[PDB]
Amino acid sequence: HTLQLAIGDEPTEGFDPMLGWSHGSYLLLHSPLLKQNEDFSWDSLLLSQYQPSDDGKTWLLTLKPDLKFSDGSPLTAKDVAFTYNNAAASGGKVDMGNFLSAEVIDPLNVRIHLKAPQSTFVNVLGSLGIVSADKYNAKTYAQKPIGAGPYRLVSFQPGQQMIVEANPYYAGNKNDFDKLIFVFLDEDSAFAAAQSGQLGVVRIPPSMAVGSVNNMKLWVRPSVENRGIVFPTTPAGKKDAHGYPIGNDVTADVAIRRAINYAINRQLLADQIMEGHAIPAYTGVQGLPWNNPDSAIKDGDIDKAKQILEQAGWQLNSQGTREKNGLPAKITLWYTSGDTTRRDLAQALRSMLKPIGIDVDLKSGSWETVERNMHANPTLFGWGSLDPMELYHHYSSNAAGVEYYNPGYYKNPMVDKHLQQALDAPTWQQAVPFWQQVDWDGTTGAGIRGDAAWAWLLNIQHTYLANNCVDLGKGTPEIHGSWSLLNSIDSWKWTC
């Protein structure tokens, strides 16, 4: 069967695990050693056995026999070792952490050596795609790659489409669709093509998940993708390396941040903006094992927000705005244009924070424009993944100002300690208790009970429209990024 999908952003700069697995359409053409389960354990497509040592410093990987690539070339230990070592030394992103080396014992066994225990290396094992040691070249791979994925590339028209076909050498199960065509369209054009019957699967914003489309069915997919506001946690007066202002004199007050957290009604955000297709999120890891269980509050509480503001010395002035030492609680919320739900979320927040006396300005821009103001102003972001490293990216002092990570320049030495403890655990199960202390350790934290570096809002569920004859099956909770639906691609069925 042939299926046409418009599910997200267009892939830019190639299909090479070596250059970066950032896009997320690699799930189509590639396959890592491990695949994550719904209980956050790990299974494997390519391995019969994978055992880390008790020290957590080394991994032993036994490959399944008779594995092949999309071109029919054999998949063995040489290719795994080549993959990991080359991605390690390439220096082009690809976080390998404490990785040292991959040694080939026999055609079916690889031994991975790490500098120190790393609880997140299991995420590397579950992300980095395997390339062919012989056939890999940085020039010809990006355009026409070979992998262990369920599909192999056939055609690619930039700005137009991308055509792939089922890989006969796939080690996993086959679905009911032998050919897939992915069209690159904006959300509205995609919806139009869905209603016209041109496409079988289309991704739509939750706002549009309303009413009935002919010969189509809505699919709500569980997701850890989120929406939240990041606060500048330091006073103003400093600039970064690129001359962008850092800090906000209003939001540097922790009371402001806690009050904003308590005044917001997350359930109303879900029901009124996301059409019920979100769940309230009080953290960046909402619903995950490493989420602090006590990190939730009873929000939409105006009187408590007012009480918090009054306790810190924020009083209404003659103009009806909170003032403290002549400084009014006037803030500007920034967000990225080109997204309707973000505009609506920002507006809704502006309306939600008014009754507690906080005046919210709105400013939308391109990411290039947002980059300049995201350190000096509260900003809308979306994140979320099955990788606990998010907590690091958000709350590590070393991540402050780096790319889009930690724009509020949050620095708490104890939180850094807990993060480092989590990283240095041999297993992720042992790391989980340390990840939770990031929120609150009983003394300090980055959560609401703590410094409240964020006003986290929602975990957004992904919405699709599929033909009535198409079953999208199930998979792990989808994440922030594009082409997340692909995580379920093996389970796809044709019911007509």
Ligand X SMILES: N[C@@H](Cc1c[nH]c[nH+]1)C(=O)O
Instruction: Provide the 10 A C-beta neighbour count for residue 83.
Output: 23
Which residues, 14 to 53, sit near ligand X by CB under 6 A? 22
Shortest Å distance, C-beta 327 to ligand X: 29
Q: Which residue number, 313 or 338, has a Cβ lying nearer to ligand X?
A: 338
197 Rama class: left (phi>0) / alpha (psi -120 to 50) / beta: left
Instruction: Provide the 10 A C-beta neighbour count for residue 495.
Output: 9
Query: For residue 84, which of 65, 66, 59, 106 has the smallest C-alpha distance?
Result: 59
Task: State which of residues 469, 481, 490, 491 lies at the interface with ligand X (CB under 6 A).
Answer: 481
Task: State which of residues 150, 382, 408, 445 lies at the interface with ligand X (CB under 6 A).
Answer: 382
Tell me if residue 161 falls in helix, strand or coil.
Answer: strand
Q: How many residues bind ligand X (CB under 6 A)?
A: 8
Phi, psi at residue 142, to the nearest 5°?
A: -60, -35
Q: Is 287 in the site for ligand X (CB under 6 A)?
A: no
Q: Would you give the distance in Å from CA 384 to the centre of its chain? A: 4
The interface region with ligand X, picked from 50-58, 375-383, 468-476, 485-493 by CB under 6 A, is 375-383
The structure tokens 């609680």 sit at 329
Tell me if residue 268 falls in helix, strand or coil.
Answer: helix
Phi, psi at residue 310, to the nearest 5°?
A: -65, -40
Q: Which residue number, 177 or 381, has a Cβ lying nearer to ligand X?
A: 381
In sequence order, what DSSP letters do the residues of 172-221 get, joined into one string? S---S-SEEEEE---HHHHHHHHHTTS-SEEEE-GGG--S--TTEEEEEE
Shortest Å distance, C-beta 458 to ligand X: 13
Query: For residue 227, which of 262, 256, 257, 269 has the smallest C-alpha distance?
Result: 269
Q: Which residue number, 222 or 481, has a Cβ lying nearer to ligand X?
A: 481
Task: State which of residues 404, 421, 440, 444 lies at the interface with ligand X (CB under 6 A).
Answer: 404
Q: Which residue number, 172 or 481, has a Cβ lying nearer to ligand X?
A: 481
Q: Is 405 in the site for ligand X (CB under 6 A)?
A: no
The interface region with ligand X, picked from 159-167, 253-261, 315-323, 377-385 by CB under 6 A, is 377-385
Shortest Å distance, C-beta 124 to ligand X: 17
Query: For residue 146, which of 156, 134, 158 has the smallest C-alpha distance?
Result: 134
Q: CA-to-CA distance for 490 and 477, rounded, in angstroms?
A: 15
Q: Which residue number, 47 or 190, has a Cβ lying nearer to ligand X?
A: 190
Which residues, 343 to 372, sit near ligand X by CB under 6 A? 367
Task: State which of residues 69, 151, 219, 381 lies at the interface with ligand X (CB under 6 A).
Answer: 381
Q: Is 172 in the site for ligand X (CB under 6 A)?
A: no
Q: Can you give the binding site for ligand X, defined by CB under 6 A? A: 22, 367, 381-383, 404, 480-481
